[PDB]
Design a protein around this ligand. Structure first.
Ligand SMILES: Nc1nc(=O)c2ncn([C@@H]3O[C@@H]4COP(=O)(O)O[C@H]5[C@@H](O)[C@H](n6cnc7c(N)ncnc76)O[C@@H]5COP(=O)(O)O[C@@H]3[C@@H]4O)c2[nH]1
Lengths: 170, 170
């Protein structure tokens, strides 16, 4: 399956490389009490906007974490950057975390729109479900995941309330 | 198929975003004489080193192109960087280009090594072939590709000679 490959791609070329160095990057930034995990937004509708504040105005960009750099596949100093968001609830800052959407969900979205990609617009939801299921299975038994990462899967609503529910569990 | 999804992912979340802005970045750097296309290395063995000079000492890093920046899926100022290499032939600089390996080939490589990933070590070569075939089909009919991109697919040997052969065609 394409979803299965994308979930494996997402772990191999991203999660596996950034999750081990994430603690040191948040500690560096702290030294506005940002949480220690990467919160990954997984909309099952594959609706992935580039600006989180457009999805919910109660999610507001605060700052970027110090950039991660690595030589990768002929690219000298490839950059991995993560953004810090503050979550508002009735005019109050209720949480602060490293938040982003899972980017492969934009591939599933674009593949369902292009005729030569071979999967209908109808198939988007089950591909998104298989992607979340594969990613949860990978992170269940992955070493780089040590209470380091949280997946927020959802079907449409308040996005900031959805994130806060997961944040309040810790 | 996994390869098919990875080729679509490679075009949607990368080629489609960097190919239209590539000319303007090479022109800026040229203000030597770097070629106008992105040369994409596609080893069918999925052998993707992080340093190009280790694959062939006749391929030597020169400089980075001005970074490309975009807000993407909740990541403010996500960075896309490309490296400029010089190709040597008997102690002479024979070519200068923006060169890199296709990164999904590291996913196919890692998936053939992990038991929960679904395809064996045996399947690596045909997945790499399907990936190249899908990517060639995508770039045949893609608008962003306007004598902008060159795929260098190969089975093992001199890598710099393989790149120079493609460079000398233009
Ligand atoms: N050569 C190269 N240079 C790049 O800068 C780059 N950026 C993406 N890609 C490849 O394009 C395709 C589409 O990208 P997508 O965002 O959907 O997936 C990405 C994305 O979900 C995540 N990821 C990797 N690097 C970053 C990053 N810097 N910021 C956010 N997410 C990232 O992990 C997936 C796999 O990454 P790569 O394994 O490097 O391969 C991707 C993929 O094949 C790149 N390929």
């Amino acid at each position: 399956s394409v979803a299965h490959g994308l979930a494996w791609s997402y772990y191999i070329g991203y999660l596996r490389l950034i999750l081990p160095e994430l603690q040191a990057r948040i500690r560096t930034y702290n030294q506005g009490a940002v949480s220690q995990r990467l919160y990954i937004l997984l909309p099952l509708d594959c609706g992935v906007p580039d600006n989180l504040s457009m999805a919910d105005p109660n999610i507001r960009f605060l700052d970027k974490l110090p950039q991660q750099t690595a030589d990768r596949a002929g690219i000298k100093d490839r950059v991995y950057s993560n953004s810090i968001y503050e979550l508002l609830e009735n005019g109050q800052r209720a949480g602060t975390c490293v938040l982003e959407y899972a980017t492969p969900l934009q591939t599933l979205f674009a593949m369902s729109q292009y005729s030569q990609a071979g999967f209908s617009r109808e198939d988007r939801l089950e591909q998104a479900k298989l992607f979340c299921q594969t990613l949860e299975d990978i992170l269940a038994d992955a070493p780089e995941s040590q209470n380091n990462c949280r997946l927020i899967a959802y079907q449409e609503f308040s996005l900031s309330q959805e994130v806060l529910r997961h944040l309040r569990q810790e």
